[PDB]
Amino acid sequence: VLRDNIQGITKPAIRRLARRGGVKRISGLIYEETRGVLKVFLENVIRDAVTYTEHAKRKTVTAMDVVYALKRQGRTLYGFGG
């Protein structure tokens, strides 16, 4: 059983995302806050994605399932199917 994988997102990875976002200086607490925010975001997206998988009675989460979850959450992603 996978556990404590949130800490697997390296500190520079959060920095890189912040750097792309234009953040010049990052407080030491942003890393834990960012991990928590992403954890909540992924929980919401995966919950809906798994819900589409379960409704389709499938066992493999298809890329379209994620797109539909993102589409429902108002964050439609282009490039993974129509």
Binding site: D48, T51, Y52, E54, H55, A56, M64, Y68, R72
Partner: protein
Amino acid sequence: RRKSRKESYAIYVYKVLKQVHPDTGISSKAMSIMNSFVNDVFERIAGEASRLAHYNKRSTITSREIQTAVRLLLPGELAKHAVSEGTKAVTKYTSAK
């Protein structure tokens, strides 16, 4: 001329009100909001149930589509209760004629 019948959930909302609070009433403005709420939630669940059927290329909307739409649209514990209520209604209804 005579005004054309306009349907509303008013009497049904009222019957539910009599169950949760027999002594409590509801103003026309509040009833209009409740009717709007019922219609909006209906369109949302029905809308998601439509997408679900289309995504699986199904021609019929069944309890499975409704149940899934409810799980998607309703947050947290509201989904569990709603699913339980929907399941109880359908299961008991199946026992009827």
